[PDB]
Design a protein around this ligand. Structure first.
Ligand SMILES: [Cl-]
Ligand SMILES: [Cl-]
Ligand SMILES: [Cl-]
Ligand SMILES: [Cl-]
Ligand SMILES: [Mg+2]
Ligand SMILES: [Mg+2]
Ligand SMILES: [Mg+2]
Ligand SMILES: [Mg+2]
Ligand SMILES: [Mg+2]
Ligand SMILES: [Mg+2]
Ligand SMILES: [Mg+2]
Ligand SMILES: [Mg+2]
Ligand SMILES: [Mg+2]
Ligand SMILES: [Mg+2]
Ligand SMILES: [Mg+2]
Ligand SMILES: [Mg+2]
Ligand SMILES: [Mg+2]
Ligand SMILES: [Mg+2]
Ligand SMILES: [Mg+2]
Ligand SMILES: [Mg+2]
Ligand SMILES: [Mg+2]
Ligand SMILES: [Mg+2]
Ligand code: NA
Ligand code: NA
Ligand code: NA
Ligand code: NA
Ligand code: NA
Ligand code: NA
Ligand code: NA
Ligand code: NA
Ligand code: NA
Ligand code: NA
Ligand code: NA
Lengths: 81, 56, 49, 65, 147
RNA sequence: UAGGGAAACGUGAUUCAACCUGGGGCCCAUGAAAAGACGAGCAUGAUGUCCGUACCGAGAACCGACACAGGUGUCCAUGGC
RNA sequence: GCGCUCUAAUUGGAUGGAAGCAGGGGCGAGAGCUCCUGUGGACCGAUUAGUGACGAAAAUCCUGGCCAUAGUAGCAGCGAUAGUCGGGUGAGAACCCCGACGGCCUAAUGGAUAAGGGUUCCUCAGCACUGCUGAUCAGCUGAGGGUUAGCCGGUCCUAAGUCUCACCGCAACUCGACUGAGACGAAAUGGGAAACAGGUUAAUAUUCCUGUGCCAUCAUGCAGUGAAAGUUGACGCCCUGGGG
RNA sequence: UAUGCCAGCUGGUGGAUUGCUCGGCUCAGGCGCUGAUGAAGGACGUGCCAAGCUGCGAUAAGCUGUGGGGAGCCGCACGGAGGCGAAGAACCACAGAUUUCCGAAUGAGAAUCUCUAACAAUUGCUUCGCGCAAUGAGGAACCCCGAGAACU
């Protein structure tokens, strides 16, 4: 079977969202809905997912911008991995 | 209005596209039929003897 | 023109196939491999579909 | 290498599922690093994490889980 | 590319070459023809005056349509090939450079031999496009000799 | 006591695109259909997934072998004299 | 009768330098044979008997390469005649950037977009290639990054019409008209539930952020048990008034 | 003696020639079906770095078992970093696991995606329930049954 999360989309812009909007960007599998992407994240990382935006990239992959609840901290999460 | 150069400029209509069945850019999206493999017309694949010399 | 998720994928692959032959391959192959016999310019060339 | 077949078979249907999810998570973090211009890598490993997972799965099949 | 067509003696002579230069081959023939027998230094002063337009290079072979220049002696047509000339100055700067690094008096050395050769075909690269027209590709040898 | 502006942070008028609503006239021409909406209240909460989205849109990003004097639809038709 | 390919039998040459090539000597009427020097660096003959995709000056012959043409034509002509002086960067500057001065475009040379293109967008590093000259510039070369929506579109509906299945025809079908059922058929520009203001990036933005607002569905609770008749969607061409 | 003619010499351009052959061409012997248990074909993925080709299929140049083989190895591909192998790897043989989407393509639609359980369609048997089955498509030519020219 296919995994929902491929890996962390790490780029300057992704950093901003992380350091500024408490947002973590991911490269996910294209058949994954927002809700699926939501769950998967709250699990592999143990947090509260507030909202998730998706975009099908010109790379053949789907990018997801995930915003964590005010409790959890994006920077603090991404730091460990 | 010449049929040449000046009439080439109106050609911005899409017809033949990548074929879901044979992978060729011969799927006529307006006809929904591949001119190469016959997808959309027949279950059997398009093929004729005249595609090669008679004794070959 | 409005594209579909499938079309968008194919284009994406095409853009990717359109990259140099990694610098190292040159050495690994004693330079017998240098040219990407599949370079496709956006203006000069035409992608299928 | 740092994992074998017999050793994978001397596990219980619950120990493999356990070992499996372990590697995946390890793999996933390996990839995460690479994605972020990772350097403290040892490429011959991210390669293994894939083969091992294959093995654990091949076995979950043979042993009936 | 070329190889020195003439034979020299290392003890009393310097060498210099230009490779695949994209510049008129016809202009080179002229310049060479023109500066042979001159002194590395005389050549430099000459070529710079040409690039200036105070001195014209006699076009004796490739002269179709070329207007007459009063400064040409014994001949009539000539021009001021500044591109080809700037390139001969490079060949000289080099020939005179090697000269001194060998305890010679470069500027005072004689141009015993200088000749241009059309080499053709630039040859595309890996990650590089192709040659537009058929710009000529020139090679040019130079042999400096002690007075 | 949103926002925006360095500041002032106007008031009246005429003619009036948009938009709104009417009356008249013509046909050997009669000027789509269906989904949907209304008809048929309120409060609190929850859900609202999937695909497109860059850029060119032309005397260099389109068709014409070309950075081609050609060709190529729509809206801005109310900026001043 | 001379020459070419390969087979056989018989018999020879070659790293103490074969074939080929360049120049040169001798023989034959000649097809041609042979030798010398240089190059080359590994194969090459003779005689006899065989074999045949076996001999070129020609076919507006084919393919490739090359010369003269020629440093010649073009890089002027278009109702859009466009630049100039300073300075910046740079190995290099008429044309890359800043300022001033002078111009060009007004339904377009401005702004937003459909189709089409497909990464051409932004950034960094490049200039061998591309750019009608040059280039430090670039749509070029390479590597990175970039497109975020309940309320913009698709999606749903039906149009001319199309396909599918059944039925029937045909020698037969990937063919063929009718009937029946189903589906498909509109992204600027048909119908249509719902979004505005400001802010924000190198690059997105009614998508992100701040503020305010609206729509649908469902759950719960209250009301109502009215509920389907009807209205709407929903309409031509010409003239005109009023509101604004 | 300019401009220049003829031949040579040195260098070049060009790629003939001679030599060489990892490819062809032809003959010969052997062998010979695949597919709803979803084929053949295609799309898209998959490598530390990976563009092409090959392989493979989300277990992705591979996983397992048996036999062979053997000190080496990580395809073409000779780099860099790293790794694997005496727990016998690489490599070969047979057998098995995995095997994305489109594709006869079969729930329905669609230019390889999408929408809310499916042998679609036509049949046979029938517990008359898709319950048990069949068909469809491919293949170098060869084969069998129909349709059937014209140049000449
Ligand atoms: Cl020339
Ligand atoms: Cl009235
Ligand atoms: Cl004779
Ligand atoms: Cl849109
Ligand atoms: Mg989106
Ligand atoms: Mg015609
Ligand atoms: Mg790219
Ligand atoms: Mg003249
Ligand atoms: Mg935009
Ligand atoms: Mg033309
Ligand atoms: Mg132009
Ligand atoms: Mg004999
Ligand atoms: Mg003749
Ligand atoms: Mg010719
Ligand atoms: Mg002339
Ligand atoms: Mg003017
Ligand atoms: Mg740009
Ligand atoms: Mg730059
Ligand atoms: Mg429809
Ligand atoms: Mg509409
Ligand atoms: Mg923009
Ligand atoms: Mg289907
Ligand atoms: Na990725
Ligand atoms: Na194009
Ligand atoms: Na002459
Ligand atoms: Na004179
Ligand atoms: Na004179
Ligand atoms: Na210019
Ligand atoms: Na066989
Ligand atoms: Na079946
Ligand atoms: Na590759
Ligand atoms: Na397999
Ligand atoms: Na049944």
């Amino acid at each position: 079977s296919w995994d929902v999360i491929k890996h962390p989309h790490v780029t300057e812009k992704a950093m901003n969202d992380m350091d500024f909007q408490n947002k973590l960007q991911f490269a996910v599998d294209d058949r994954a809905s927002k809700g699926e992407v939501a769950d998967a994240v709250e699990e592999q990382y143990d947090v509260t997912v507030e909202q998730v935006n998706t975009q099908n990239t010109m790379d053949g992959e789907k990018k997801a911008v995930v915003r964590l609840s005010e409790d959890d901290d994006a920077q603090e999460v991404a730091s460990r991995i | 209005t010449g049929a040449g150069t000046p009439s080439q400029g109106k050609k911005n209509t899409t017809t033949h596209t990548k074929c879901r069945r044979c992978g060729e850019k011969s799927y006529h999206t307006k006809k929904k039929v591949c001119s190469s493999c016959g997808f959309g017309k027949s279950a059997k694949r398009r093929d004729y003897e005249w595609q090669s010399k008679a004794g070959e | 023109g409005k594209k579909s998720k499938a079309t968008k994928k194919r284009l994406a692959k095409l853009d990717n196939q359109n990259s140099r032959v990694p610098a190292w391959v040159m050495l690994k192959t004693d330079r017998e491999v240098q040219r990407n016999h599949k370079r496709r310019h956006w203006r000069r060339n035409d992608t299928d579909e | 290498t740092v994992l074998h077949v017999q050793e994978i078979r001397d596990m219980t249907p619950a120990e493999r599922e356990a070992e499996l999810d372990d590697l995946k998570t390890e793999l996933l973090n390996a990839r995460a690093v690479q994605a972020a211009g990772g350097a403290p890598e040892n490429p011959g490993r991210i390669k293994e994490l894939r083969k091992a997972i294959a093995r654990i799965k091949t076995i979950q099949g043979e042993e009936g889980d | 590319g070329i190889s020195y067509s003439v034979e020299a003696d290392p003890d009393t002579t310097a060498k210099a070459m230009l490779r695949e230069r994209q510049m008129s081959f016809k202009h080179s023939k002229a310049i060479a023809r023109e500066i042979k027998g001159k002194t590395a230094g005389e050549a430099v002063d000459y070529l710079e005056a040409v690039i200036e337009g105070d001195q014209p290079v006699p076009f004796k072979q490739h002269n179709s349509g070329v207007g007459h220049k009063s400064k040409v002696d014994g001949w009539d047509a000539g021009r001021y090939p500044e591109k080809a000339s700037k390139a001969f100055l490079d060949l000289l700067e080099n020939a005179v450079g090697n000269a001194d690094h060998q305890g010679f008096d470069g500027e005072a050395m004689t141009i015993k031999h200088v000749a241009a050769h059309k080499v053709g075909e630039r040859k595309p690269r890996a990650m590089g496009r192709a040659s537009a027209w058929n710009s000529p590709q020139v090679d040019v040898e130079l042999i400096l000799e002690e007075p």
